[PDB]
Design a protein around this ligand. Sequence first.
Ligand SMILES: CC(C)N1CCC(NC(=O)c2c(Cl)cccc2Cl)CC1
Ligand SMILES: CC(C)N1CCC(NC(=O)c2c(Cl)cccc2Cl)CC1
Ligand SMILES: CC(C)N1CCC(NC(=O)c2c(Cl)cccc2Cl)CC1
Ligand SMILES: *[C@@H]1O[C@H](CO)[C@@H](O)[C@H](O)[C@H]1NC(C)=O
Ligand SMILES: *[C@@H]1O[C@H](CO)[C@@H](O)[C@H](O)[C@H]1NC(C)=O
Ligand SMILES: *[C@@H]1O[C@H](CO)[C@@H](O)[C@H](O)[C@H]1NC(C)=O
Ligand SMILES: *[C@@H]1O[C@H](CO)[C@@H](O)[C@H](O)[C@H]1NC(C)=O
Ligand SMILES: *[C@@H]1O[C@H](CO)[C@@H](O)[C@H](O)[C@H]1NC(C)=O
Ligand SMILES: *[C@@H]1O[C@H](CO)[C@@H](O)[C@H](O)[C@H]1NC(C)=O
Ligand SMILES: *[C@@H]1O[C@H](CO)[C@@H](O)[C@H](O)[C@H]1NC(C)=O
Ligand SMILES: *[C@@H]1O[C@H](CO)[C@@H](O)[C@H](O)[C@H]1NC(C)=O
Lengths: 322, 322, 320, 142, 174, 174
Amino acid sequence: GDQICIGYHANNSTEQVDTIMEKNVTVTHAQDILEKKHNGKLCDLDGVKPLILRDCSVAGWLLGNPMCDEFINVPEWSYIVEKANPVNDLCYPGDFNDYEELKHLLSRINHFEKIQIIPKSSWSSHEASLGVSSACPYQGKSSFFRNVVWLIKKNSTYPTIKRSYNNTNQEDLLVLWGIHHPNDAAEQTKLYQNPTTYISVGTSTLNQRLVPRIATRSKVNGQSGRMEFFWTILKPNDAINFESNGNFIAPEYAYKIVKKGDSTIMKSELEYGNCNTKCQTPMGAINSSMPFHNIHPLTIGECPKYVKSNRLVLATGLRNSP
Amino acid sequence: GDQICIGYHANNSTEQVDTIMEKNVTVTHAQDILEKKHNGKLCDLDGVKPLILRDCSVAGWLLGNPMCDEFINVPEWSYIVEKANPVNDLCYPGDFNDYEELKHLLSRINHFEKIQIIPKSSWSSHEASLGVSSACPYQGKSSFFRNVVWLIKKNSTYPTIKRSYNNTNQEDLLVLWGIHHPNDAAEQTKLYQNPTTYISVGTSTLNQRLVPRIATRSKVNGQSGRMEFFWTILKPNDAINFESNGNFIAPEYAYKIVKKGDSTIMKSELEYGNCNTKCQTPMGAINSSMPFHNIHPLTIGECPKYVKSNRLVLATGLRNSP
Amino acid sequence: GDQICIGYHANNSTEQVDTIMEKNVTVTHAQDILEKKHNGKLCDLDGVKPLILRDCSVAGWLLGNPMCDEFINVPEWSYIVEKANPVNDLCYPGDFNDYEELKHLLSRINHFEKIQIIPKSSWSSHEASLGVSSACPYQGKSSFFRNVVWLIKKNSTYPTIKRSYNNTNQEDLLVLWGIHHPNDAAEQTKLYQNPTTYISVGTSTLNQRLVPRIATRSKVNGQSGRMEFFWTILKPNDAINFESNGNFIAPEYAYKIVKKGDSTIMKSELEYGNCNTKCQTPMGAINSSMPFHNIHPLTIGECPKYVKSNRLVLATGLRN
Amino acid sequence: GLFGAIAGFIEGGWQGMVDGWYGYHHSNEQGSGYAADKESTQKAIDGVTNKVNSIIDKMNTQFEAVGREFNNLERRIENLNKKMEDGFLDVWTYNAELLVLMENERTLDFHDSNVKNLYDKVRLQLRDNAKELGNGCFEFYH
Amino acid sequence: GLFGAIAGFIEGGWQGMVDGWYGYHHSNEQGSGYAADKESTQKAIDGVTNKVNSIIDKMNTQFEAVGREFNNLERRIENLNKKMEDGFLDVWTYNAELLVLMENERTLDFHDSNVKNLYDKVRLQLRDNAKELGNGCFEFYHKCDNECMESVRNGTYDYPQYSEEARLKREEIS
Amino acid sequence: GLFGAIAGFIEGGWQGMVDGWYGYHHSNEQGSGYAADKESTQKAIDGVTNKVNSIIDKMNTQFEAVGREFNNLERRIENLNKKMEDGFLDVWTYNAELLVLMENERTLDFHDSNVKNLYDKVRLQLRDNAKELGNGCFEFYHKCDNECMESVRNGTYDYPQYSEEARLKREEIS
Ligand SMILES: CC(C)N1CCC(NC(=O)c2c(Cl)cccc2Cl)CC1
Ligand SMILES: CC(C)N1CCC(NC(=O)c2c(Cl)cccc2Cl)CC1
Ligand SMILES: CC(C)N1CCC(NC(=O)c2c(Cl)cccc2Cl)CC1
Ligand SMILES: *[C@@H]1O[C@H](CO)[C@@H](O)[C@H](O)[C@H]1NC(C)=O
Ligand SMILES: *[C@@H]1O[C@H](CO)[C@@H](O)[C@H](O)[C@H]1NC(C)=O
Ligand SMILES: *[C@@H]1O[C@H](CO)[C@@H](O)[C@H](O)[C@H]1NC(C)=O
Ligand SMILES: *[C@@H]1O[C@H](CO)[C@@H](O)[C@H](O)[C@H]1NC(C)=O
Ligand SMILES: *[C@@H]1O[C@H](CO)[C@@H](O)[C@H](O)[C@H]1NC(C)=O
Ligand SMILES: *[C@@H]1O[C@H](CO)[C@@H](O)[C@H](O)[C@H]1NC(C)=O
Ligand SMILES: *[C@@H]1O[C@H](CO)[C@@H](O)[C@H](O)[C@H]1NC(C)=O
Ligand SMILES: *[C@@H]1O[C@H](CO)[C@@H](O)[C@H](O)[C@H]1NC(C)=O
C-alpha cells in the first residue's frame, strides 16, 4: 500500500543547550547570545583617544610631578586610564584632600585648558625659585611640582601675602594650592622666618584657614616634611582670595573645564592598540552585536549587558537524533 | 442526523495583550493592572495638610529668615514640600553644619512646638537689638534670622557670656546657634572689641570650641562676612552650656519634638490644591485600586507599587476570533 | 475478555504544595527546602571558639577598661559577639575617633597579640601612677584603662615628651592613644602645669596635632572632663613618633595583627553553649542540608541561603 | 496554540455563547441553540482569579524609594544612592513585565487545554454511538 | 490538569501500585495484579531530581547580608545600608517563592503528560487487536496470558501474531 | 517530551528533509521522496524569532556598574559599594540564566506540539481511508499518486472521491 509519514528535521549539529530538567541537549539550531572575545588592548572610543597616564597618578598629572611632563598639556580625551599603583604620584610626600571626590568630578570632564592664574615672576617680596627638593628630581637636579610654587623668605623676611584671582572665563576653573608641614621650629624659621603661620582662602562658598602642623615623621622619598594639597571649583565671575605669612604652596597654573560629557577613570595595566571601538573594558575592547558579554563589569560606550555566565545558548530548532 | 458541537466564547472585545512569542493578541477579557492617571495637585494625606514651604528652604524656616514669617508657627503636617532651588535660604551668606543630616531627622517628624529658651530681652551686658543686615531685609528695613540673636558689644565692651539652658521638657529639643566670621580685624574690633574670640558649647555628649576665621571673601548678598550655624538634640534633663567673648549668634527660639512618624521632604514646584488623598506623588495625587502605577517612584501613603512600564495587561479570557 | 489498564501512584500523603492557580494541593511526594530550626546557642565554628565579650564593648576590651580583665589576653577567635548595649565601655566618658571604621577592620581579624611599645616604668620626668578616676573603679578603688597611661605633672613641672617606637615585627600594629579635655584653666594648671598644650603624632602616613578643648559639660559617670581616643595602623618597618607638653593619654600596649581572615562582630544577648557548628546565627546555630533558612539574615560559616518565607515546598510526586 | 483545539481543529469561537467561556451547540428536531458548560467554565474562573490575586500579592514585598540628600562634596555617595534606587526600580519593573508575559502565554494555553479536554470528555462518552466530523462536532447515530 | 489524563479520563490513582509512579493493572485467566513501568518512572525521577538540583544551584550566588555600623551623624548612609540589604533580601525571597510556584505547576503537568504518553504508547501497540474502554483500560479481542501482557509492558507486542484471531472475535465471522 | 511526538511515537528525525523543520515522506508507485510543510515551519520560525527578540529587549534595562573610589578610612562605604554592585550583577546573571533555561524547555515542547498537530491535521483528513501504523506513517487503503499526496500536504484531500475504493480494500484486509 501507498504511505504518507509525518516527521521532523535532523542534521549534523553538535550545538548543546540546557533546560531545568536536562543538561547538554543536542539541538538542530541554536543562538549563542554571550560575547566571550576581546582584542586585549586600549582603543579610541568612537574616534577619540583616551588619556593614558602610564606611570603617573591623576595627582601626579594635575600638580605636575616633574616625571609627568608628557601630560603638561593634554588634548581632549574619551576616557582616562590609570594603573592600579602608579609610581609617579606625590614626589614630595603628603596628602591630597578630597582626592576621590576630585576623581569623581574628572569622570564628567573630557577637556581642560591649563591657564596661568598667578605668574611665578610676580612674587617680588618672596623667593619663588628656591622651592625645590631632591624628592622631586628632574634630569638629576632637585625640582618641584610644576603647577604650584613653593614660596621662601627673601632677605630673612616673609611679608604677608594678599593675592586674588577673578575667574573672568565662562567656564568653571579647578584651582590647586598647598601647605608645607615642616619637621621642627628651626626648619620653620629657616624657610619662612615667622614662627606662627596660616593660609586663609575665600571664595563665594569657601572659608578656609589652614595652620601648619609640626610633628616628627618617618622619611618618605628622603623627606620628613609633608605637603598637603587642596582644591576648589571657582565658578564664573567668582574670585579666590589668598592670605598667608608662610608655608604657602601657591597656585601658578589652574585648569579651565572646557568640555563636559561621559567619561570614566578605568584601572588597567593594558597597552594602547592604535584601534577604534564603540565599547572598551579594562581587559580589552569588544566588537559584537551579541546582547550579553562576560569580559568585565566596568565598561564604557555602547556595550552588551554584563553577566557572570560561562555559557548562554538559546534553543531555536528541535531536539536532534544522535 | 442529530449533532452536538463543542466550542468556546468569542465577543466584540478589542483588548490586546502580549506574550513572549506574540505581541498584540486580541482576547475576550483582560485586566489592566497599571494606574497611569493623577490629579496634578498637592493634597492632604488622610485629612492632614502638608507643610508647603513655597519659596523658603528648611534652613530659612528653622533659622527664621524674615521672608519666611508665614512659617513662624506651623501646625502638625503629613509631609513637607520644598522647591528644587528655594530663593529664601541663608539671607546672610554662610553654611549650615550637617544640614542634610538635619533634613534626614525632619523626615521622621510631624510636629515641632517652637519655644523661647533665651529671651532677646535677657542680654543686659550686650546689645541684642543691633544685629541686623541689609542682606536680611524685612519691608525695606535691615533685619536678621528671627530664631537666633546676633550679639554686639555694649559701650565698647563684650564681657564673657556664660549661659545655660536645662531641657525640663519630656521631649527632645532641637537647639540652633552660630558664629560670625568677619571680613577683617577692624570689623572684629568694631562689633566685638576683643580681638581673639571663641564659642565653647557643652552638653552630656557635645564638646565644641569654635574660633572665627578672618579672611577676605567675595560679596554674597552684599556681604564678605559669613555666618556658620550649628545644631544639636538636647535630651530631656540634659543641659547646654555656652561660653563666648565674641562672634556668638545665640539661640532665642528652639523646637520641641512633639510628634514623630512617617513623613518625607518631597521636591515639587506645585502649590496646595485643597484636596484629600490616601496616596501623594510630587507630580500629583493617586485615587486607584490598581496594584501598580507609573507616575513617580517617590510616593507617600497607601500607594500602588511603582514600575517604569507604559502598559501592564493580564490575559483573563481566550484568544478572540475576528 | 482479557484487560490491561494504565494508571498512576496514590498514597496516604497529606503533604501540600502551592502553584500560581491553586493553593494547598495534596501530592504523593514533596521536598521541604526551608530550614526553620536552630539550637538557640553560640557555638565554636569548625572547632574554633568565638570571642564572647559578655558585658564589655570592643572599646572596653581594646583600651582595657578595668572591668574587662577577662579579655586582657585573648586566644585566636572564629567570630566576635557583643551585646546591643554593653555596660563596660568608656568608664571615663568621651569619644573613640573612627570607632565604626575600627570595628570594620576587626571583622577581618582572627588574632591580636599584645606588645609593649612604651614601658610604664620609662616615665621618670612625669607621674605615671596618679592617672586614676572614681569613674573607672577596680575592686572599690579608683583605676583607669590598662593599655594606656594618664600622665600627670611631677613636682609642678611637665617637660616635653619625645617617644618613638619602630615596628620591627613582620605584622601591622594597631596603636591606641588619647587626649584629656579638662573642665577649666585651673584644672589644666593643676594636672599639667603648662596652659597651652598639644599632642603631635607622626608615621610615614599620619600627620596629627591634637589640642585640648575647654567647654562646660554635663557630668557623665561623675565627670565633666572627656577622654578622646585615636588609633592608627603602623606598617612593618615604619616608626610612630609622639611629642606632648600635656593632656597625653600615652600608649603602653598596642596589638600585633597576627591572623587575618573571615570573621564578623555579631550582636547577640546569648552566652557560650559548649557546642560545635559549621553555621552560626545571632539567635542560634544551624545543622542542615536544606538549601534555604528563615532564621536570621546575618550568619557566618557554610550556611543555607536566607529568605523571608514561612514555607518553601517543591512538588516531586503527583496530585493525590 | 499548544493543545491544537482553539483556532485549530475547532476553527473559530461563538459570538452566540454569551453566558460561558466553553460549551455546546445542539441541533435536533426541537431546534438549534447554544448552552455553556458550567462545571469547566467555573473551574477556569477559579484558576484565573487565583492567578491574578497570586501575581498582585507576590508584588506586596516590592522596593520603596526614599528621598536622601547629599552636599557638593558627597557626589560619590549621591551617585551610589541614585544607582541603588534606579537598580531596584529596574529589577522590579523587569519582574512585573516578565511575570505578566509568561502568565499571559500560560493562560491562553490553559483555555486551549480546557477546550481539548471538554471535546475528549464527550468523545469518550459517545464512543461508536456517534461519528467524529473533525470540526468539533459529533453526528449522532440516533 | 493540562494533559487530561490524571484525575481526567483516568478517574483516580492506585494505592495498590507501590514500587512505581506510573504503570499497569492486568486481569487475565491466570489472575489480576499491578506492575510499574520502570522506563517512564526512571525518566520522571531523573527529570525531577535534575529540576530540584537546578533550583538549588541557581540560588548558590544569592545575596549575603553583612554587618556595618554607623554613628549618630551617619543616619543617611545607615538608612541607605538598611534599605540596600532589605532590598536584596526581598528580591531573592520573591525569586525563591516564584520559581517554586512556577516549577510546582510544571511538575504536576509533567506527571499528567507522562501518564497520557504511557496510555498512547500502549494504544498504538494494540491498534484494532483491542477495544478502548475510555477509562484507561484496553479489553483484548484475543487471549493475553502473563507472557503476552509483559510484551505490552516492555514495548515489544507482536501485532501480526494475534491480528487474525482478533479479527475473528471482533467482526462477524463471514 | 510533553506532547509525545518528537523522540516519542515518531522515533527519530529525517537527515533527508533539509528545507524544513516539519513535513512529509510519501511512497507510492511513482516512487518515494521528502517534502516540508511550509505553513507550520514558517509559523514556528515567526514564533522563535519573536521569542529571541523578546528575551534580548527585556534585558535592555539591566544594571550598569560604575567605578567609585574610597580612601583607607572609608572602608565601610567601600564595602557597601562593592556589595551593592556585586548584588545587582548576581541578580541580572540569575535573571538571564533562568529566562534562557525556562524558555529553552518551552521551545523544545513548542516543536513537539507543532509535530503532534501536523500529524493530527493529516489523520482528521484521511479518517478510515487509511491505516494508522503508529510510527507517524499512514498506509493508504487506495492508490494515492503524486497529485493525491499534494492534496494531503496542502490540506484539501477529497475524502468522498476515494472512500468507496478504500472501504472495499479495508473490509478485505480487516
Ligand atoms: C462570560 C463570563 C462568565 N466571563 C468569564 C469569567 C469572567 N472573569 C474574568 O475574566 C476575570 C476578570 Cl475580568 C478579572 C479577574 C478574574 C477573572 Cl476570572 C469574565 C467574563
Ligand atoms: C515510588 C517511589 C520510588 N517514587 C519515585 C520517586 C521518589 N522520590 C522523589 O519523589 C524525589 C524526592 Cl522526595 C526528592 C528529590 C528527588 C525525587 Cl525523584 C518517591 C516516589
Ligand atoms: C532553514 C531551516 C531548516 N531552519 C529553520 C529556520 C532557522 N532559524 C533558526 O534556527 C533561528 C536562529 Cl539560528 C536564530 C534566530 C531565530 C531563528 Cl528562528 C534555522 C534553519
Ligand atoms: C556537557 O558536556 C561538556 C563536555 O566537555 C562538559 O563540560 C559538561 O560538564 C557536560 N555536562 C554534563 C551534565 O554532562
Ligand atoms: C633687607 O631688609 C631690611 C629691612 O627689612 C633692610 O634693612 C635691608 O637693607 C635689606 N637688605 C637688602 C640687601 O635688601
Ligand atoms: C500594537 O498595536 C498598537 C495600536 O493599537 C500599536 O501602538 C503598536 O505599534 C502595535 N505593536 C506591534 C508590535 O505590532
Ligand atoms: C569678578 O570680575 C567680574 C567682572 O568680569 C565682576 O562681575 C565680579 O563682581 C568680580 N567678582 C569679585 C568677587 O570681585
Ligand atoms: C537639669 O535640671 C534637673 C532638675 O532640676 C536636674 O535634676 C538635672 O541635673 C539638670 N541637668 C543638668 C545637665 O544639669
Ligand atoms: C490552606 O489555604 C490557606 C489560604 O487559602 C492558607 O492560609 C493555609 O496555608 C492552608 N491551611 C489552612 C488555612 O489551615
Ligand atoms: C622640685 O623642683 C626643684 C628641682 O630642681 C627642687 O626645688 C625640689 O627639690 C624638687 N623636688 C622635690 C621632690 O621637691
Ligand atoms: C626601623 O628600623 C629599621 C632597622 O634599624 C630601619 O631600616 C628602618 O628604616 C626604621 N624605620 C624608620 C621609619 O626609621
